[model samples]
Target chain A: FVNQHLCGSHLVEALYLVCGERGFFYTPKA
Target chain B: GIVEQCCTSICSLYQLENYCN
Candidate 1:
C-alpha cells in the first residue's frame, strides 16, 4: 500500500473527511 | 512485474484498520 492503495484511500478519505463527517480517518501513527 | 520486487507484505503488515490518525 505504499503508494498504490494510498491512491484510492486518499481519495476516499478526503471525500469522507471533507464531505462525509469529521475531517479524520484511520491512519498510522507514523 | 519486476518493480513489484520492491513491494512486500510489510505495507499490509501495518495495514491494520487504524481508528484515528
Candidate 2:
C-alpha cells in the first residue's frame, strides 16, 4: 500500500497494471 | 484524502479490503 502515497496519476498508472484491463480509471485533480 | 481515494479505488476493484481508515 506504500504506493498509495504516490501522486494520483502515478497511482492510477501503477494500479492499472496490477488491476488489469478491467481496472477502473481515475482522473487526477488539477 | 488522497490516501482514502486510493484505498477506495483499489478496494472497489476488489484488490484490497476497506483499509482506508
Candidate 3:
C-alpha cells in the first residue's frame, strides 16, 4: 500500500478494484 | 535459512490472499 501511495490515488484505488475481484468483490459505490 | 524463506513466502501469499477479505 505504501508503494501504491507513492504511485498516487489512481493506482491505489485501482489496486483495490483489482484486489476486490480476486475474492471480496469490492464495490466502491456507496 | 530454508525454513525462514518458506515462511516468508507463505506469509506473503497469505497477505495477498486475505487482504481483500
Candidate 4:
C-alpha cells in the first residue's frame, strides 16, 4: 500500500498538520 | 503492531478496534 497508502500515516500526519492537536493528538509539542 | 511493541513483557493482545470509520 506504499504507492496508494490510503487513510494511514500520511492521513494522520496531514490531519495533525492541518487540524492541529485538538482533533488528533490533542496536545502536540515541539 | 506498535502498541504491541510499547509492551515488551507481553501476553497476547487483541488488535481490536470497536468503531472504525
Candidate 5:
C-alpha cells in the first residue's frame, strides 16, 4: 500500500498523478 | 500490526495506498 502522504489531496488527484486521467477517470461513455 | 493486511488483497481506499505505502 502506498503512503497517504505520498498521495495527492484528493483521490482523483492521486490517480491523475500516477496512472493519468485516461486510466483513472475515463470520459463518461455515452 | 498498525498496518492492516487483507490476507490476499490490499486496501481499496486511496488512503491506504497513499498512507500505507
Candidate 6:
C-alpha cells in the first residue's frame, strides 16, 4: 500500500505532473 | 496506465529509500 502520510508532500504533486490524476489509484505489480 | 503505475511505484520507493534511511 502507498503510504501517503510518510511520503514527501511533493509526491502527489509530482505524480500529477508526471502521471496525471489517475496516478492516485494506480496499483503497481510486486 | 503504465505511467501511473510507474509514478506510484516510484513514490513508494521514494518513501522507503528516503524515510527509512
Compose the digit string of candidate 1's lDDT tens values, residues B1-21.
Answer: 111211222222123222223
Candidate 1 local lDDT, residue A4: 37
Clash pairs for candidate 2: none
Number of the predicted model whose DockQ against the real structure is largest: 2
Chain A accuracy as TM-score for every candidate: 0.38, 0.41, 0.40, 0.40, 0.38, 0.35
Model 1 chain A lowest lDDT segment of ten: A21-30
Instruction: Encode model 3's per-residue lDDT on B1-21: one tens digit a residue.
Output: 212322223223333334355
Q: Per-residue lDDT tens digits of candidate 2, residues B1-21?
A: 334556444333343222211
Interface RMSD of 4: 10.9
Worst 10 residues of 6 chain A by lDDT: A21-30
In model 6, the runs with Cα more than 4 Å from the true position are A1-6, A21-23, A26-30, B1-21
Q: Write the per-residue lDDT of candidate 1 for residues A1-30, one digit (tens) a residue.
A: 233333335434533443343333432322
Better of 2 and 3 by DockQ: 2
User: Clashing residue pairs in candidate 4, if any?
Assistant: none
**Interface RMSD for all numbered candidates:** 9.4, 8.0, 12.0, 10.9, 11.7, 10.7
lDDT of 6: 0.39
What does the lDDT read for residue A17 in candidate 2? Answer: 60
True contacts kept of each: 0.12, 0.04, 0.11, 0.00, 0.00, 0.05
**Index of the highest-lDDT prediction:** 2
Note the Cα lDDT for every prediction shown: 0.32, 0.45, 0.35, 0.30, 0.35, 0.39
lDDT of 2 at B1: 39
Strongest candidate by TM-score = 2
User: Against the true structure, what is every candidate's RMSD?
Assistant: 9.0, 7.1, 11.0, 10.2, 10.7, 10.6
